[PDB]
Each structure stands twice: as C-alpha cells, then as structure tokens.
Ligand binder design. Structure first.
Ligand SMILES: CCN(CC)c1cc(C)nc2ncnn12
Ligand SMILES: CCN(CC)c1cc(C)nc2ncnn12
Ligand SMILES: [Cl-]
Ligand SMILES: [Mg+2]
Ligand SMILES: [Mg+2]
Ligand SMILES: [Mg+2]
Ligand SMILES: [Mg+2]
Lengths: 194, 194
C-alpha cells in the first residue's frame, strides 16, 4: 500500500548523505520525508555488531563491550564491538575481524541475524547482529591484542551477563557514559526473561 | 582525553541536519567526522522514547507488543517497539505512555525508564529513553484497543509471545518483505540467551 515514488539528493558528504524522499501514504496522498543514508554501502547491510559472550570456566559469563569517543555524540559511549562490512566481506567474517581489532579476542560464530535496522525513522542504516562465543580459556584469548585500525581508540569493558543491566546503569551514573540502545535492550531482556 | 573542538553546519533540513564535527583525538591530533542530528531536540534529555510493552493477561503467556509501519528512509515496512519523539516539556514516561496509546490503543503502566541511550553513535547524536511498561490486558480499557494515529501515521499492531519472540520474528521475516528493528532483535536474542 505505501511505497517510494522518488528520492532527491539534498547533501552528500564523504561518509553520509541527506535525501528528500517522496512516498505514497496509504490514503493515496503523496508525502515527503528527510532520510539519512551512508555513502559506503555495496553488502547485506552497512555493518555488523557483535554480541561477544566471553566464557571462562569458574567465572561468570561476560558480555564484552567497548568504550570509545563518538564525535556525533560529543562523548564516550559503551557499545557492542562493531564496524562496517568491507566490500565482498561476509557478515560472519566482518564480525570476527571487528571483534579481534576492537577487543583482541578470537571468537566462534554462534548465530547471525538478518539485516536489522538502526533508526528507521531517520536512516536506512542496517546491521547484522552476530552472536559470538569466546573461549577465554584458550591460549589465543589469554592476553588479547586489540589491533586498532588507524584513528580508532577503543577500551574494552567486560561485564557479567547475569547482572548486565545493573552494571550498565552504574557506569552511566558513575562515569557519565552513554550506553548504546542495542546493548541496553539486550540487558533489559536478560532481566525480563521468564 | 577526547573532545569536540567545533561543529559546522553543512546542510539543515526541517527535521534533520548534517554537521562537520572537529574533535581532538587521543594522540593530540585534530580530526573530523560527519555528524547527523535532528532539528527537533530542545531541552529534552533525549530525542525520543521507545516503549517495551509487556502485555499481561490472565491465563495467557506474556506478549511483547510491536508495531509495523512504512518507514520512508528504509523504503519498506519495519517491525519496531512503539516509539516517538518527546514533545517539548514532556517527560520520557509521559511520552512513552502517550506514544504507546496512540500507536497501539493500549493504556500501559510504567515499570522502568532507562537513561538516555544512543541510537547509532558513529553516525548521529540521536538518543532515546527505553521505557518498559506493563499493559493489564484484563482491564476493560485494554479489551478492544484502537490505535489513534496522527496525521501521516498508519500503524499495525503485532503482539508476539515473549517466550517465543525470536522465532516468531524470524517467521515474520521469512514470510514477508519487512525489516526487524535492531533493538527488537537484540531484545529477542537476549530472551533466548537467558
Ligand atoms: C519526527 C517524525 N517526522 C514528522 C511526522 C518527520 C521526520 C523526518 C526525518 N522527516 C520528515 N518529513 C516529514 N515529517 N518528518
Ligand atoms: C565509517 C567510520 N568513519 C571512517 C573512520 C567515518 C564516519 C563518518 C560518519 N564520518 C567520518 N569522518 C571521518 N571518518 N568518518
Ligand atoms: Cl549465547
Ligand atoms: Mg567500531
Ligand atoms: Mg574498524
Ligand atoms: Mg512512532
Ligand atoms: Mg507516534
């Protein structure tokens, strides 16, 4: 019933553009929307985010997260490890690569979502969410080496899965960080389960 | 270590703008970023709210109430938590209850309210509060709930059992051309993972 009629370029950066979208509303009236898109998509999706489940025996399972300065936010954010998918890279491969560059951990794929949207009232940005387990008892994950690309500066924060929401709420109040909505949603469901 | 040096407007729409952000990297070098921001954010603690609406009924499994709408930035239909922008002077809780009623017809009760969390922090400054609300589906006010859509609002309600949420979303994606929201998918993954 609703569909895109045309798209007008408003402004095009190196990394992001703004478009004016005309679409048919379901009454048969034509309407406009301001839409953001990345300039980098090729790919199943723009990016991957990794849910990295760090498993060490005799320890709580942790979720591995990352803290970095985010210029659009003007501050530091706590997020799942994540990055854009390289041209001709598979989402699974982007996930293991990003996880290793951002955390130093070497992981195994558990499951991979379909392309899911990031903020669909504003942008067309999508990701695959890739669940990965990390055998923290293996030697390759003993002293994990974060291999930042150029211009990336990432701290690693591992939090216990079974107290995640309370741990996140603490970091916000105590450290004035911004938690990522996907991270927060995950944490909420861990509490809301049963 | 890192901080914003300057924000230059590149292009300003009615609803969205694009900025060139200059910031200080942690080596002491000056760098730039392309930042998306809304034009609608004033004194709110965030741009918007998303509502996690837990529908509770005697002798029924708990359901998560979701909405399906056409999203011009995506060029198609998306399945999302009920959500909207916070009106000027409105509290996040009130915004949540209001958007839930407008989009679904249901009258909820506040459970919890998150701090402001970021939507896509490598791209935009956009933030929401995630508001968990319970809906007493035995109350007569919630027996036969009618969405009150605004001008240009056309929303379908999809209530899915919490205990099978991820499979039920997968089955929707398999049988139709739609995209699931990444916060919804994140929430459904954690429900499985717990
Ligand atoms: C805040 C949601 N609204 C208002 C209905 C928006 C958002 C954007 C990004 N573009 C738009 N073009 C027309 N309305 N509109
Ligand atoms: C894809 C992540 N990067 C590349 C490091 C980006 C993204 C945006 C939005 N602006 C940017 N300005 C400079 N680098 N940059
Ligand atoms: Cl898992
Ligand atoms: Mg990254
Ligand atoms: Mg990278
Ligand atoms: Mg809405
Ligand atoms: Mg609304």
């Amino acid at each position: 019933k609703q569909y895109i009629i045309s798209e007008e370029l408003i402004s095009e950066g190196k990394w992001v553009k703004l478009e004016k979208t005309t679409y048919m509303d379901p009454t048969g009236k034509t309407r406009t929307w301001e839409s953001v898109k990345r300039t980098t998509r090729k790919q199943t999706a723009d990016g991957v985010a990794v849910i990295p489940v760090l498993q060490r025996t005799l320890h709580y399972e942790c979720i591995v997260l990352v803290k970095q300065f985010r210029p659009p936010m003007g501050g530091y954010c706590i997020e799942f490890p994540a990055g854009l998918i390289d041209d001709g890279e598979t989402p699974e491969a982007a996930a293991l690569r990003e996880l290793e560059e951002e955390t130093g951990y070497k992981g195994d794929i558990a499951e991979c979502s379909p392309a899911v949207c990031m903020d669909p009232g504003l942008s067309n940005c999508t990701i695959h969410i890739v669940t990965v387990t990390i055998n923290g008892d293996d030697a390759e994950n003993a002293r994990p080496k974060p291999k930042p690309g150029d211009g990336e500066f990432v701290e690693v924060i591992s939090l216990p899965k079974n107290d995640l929401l309370q741990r996140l709420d603490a970091l916000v109040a105590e450290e004035h960080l911004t938690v990522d909505a996907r991270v927060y949603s995950y944490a909420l469901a861990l509490k809301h389960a049963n």
